Nucleic acid binder design. Structure first.
Lengths: 70, 70
RNA sequence: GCAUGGACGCGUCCAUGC
RNA sequence: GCAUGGACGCGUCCAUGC
């Protein structure tokens, strides 16, 4: 796994790590708990988008990409 | 995989997703790049902590645990 | 100068638990 | 009050692009 490979795969992996939890069903959950599980969803989503943004941000930096290329 | 388990295994799942990347070394890169990679490390470490804290917050709620299993 | 990304600081608000 | 998440405001630092 190349240094550039590690970074290019982070977003995918984070997705994999989170899917199970997010894809959970709580349709029958009480109100307060529902509010909590929605919040969890928001949290996981923000985490995921934030890591994605950072990766994208990184690959656009020519200087960084050169280093991850030799 | 019970619902309560999907929340309990989030941290371990994220560790698996991230450990590789936030474990790579780059002491040989120029300052600007080394600095950009530390930023990545900081980003990842924070998302990792955010998930753990949320998972903890959920698990400390009688309501959520009670519902997560009936 | 403008914009983007991240980290951080101070604060306002919302939810949930105690 | 404290904890955790989320939205938002102002500011700091780092990096890149224009």
């Amino acid at each position: 796994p190349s240094k550039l490979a590690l970074i290019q795969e982070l977003p995918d992996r984070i997705q994999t790590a989170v899917e199970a939890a997010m894809g959970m069903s709580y349709q029958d959950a009480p109100n307060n708990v529902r509010r909590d599980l929605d919040n969890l969803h928001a949290c996981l989503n923000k985490a995921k988008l934030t890591v994605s943004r950072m990766v994208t941000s990184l690959l656009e930096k020519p200087s960084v990409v050169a280093y991850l290329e030799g």
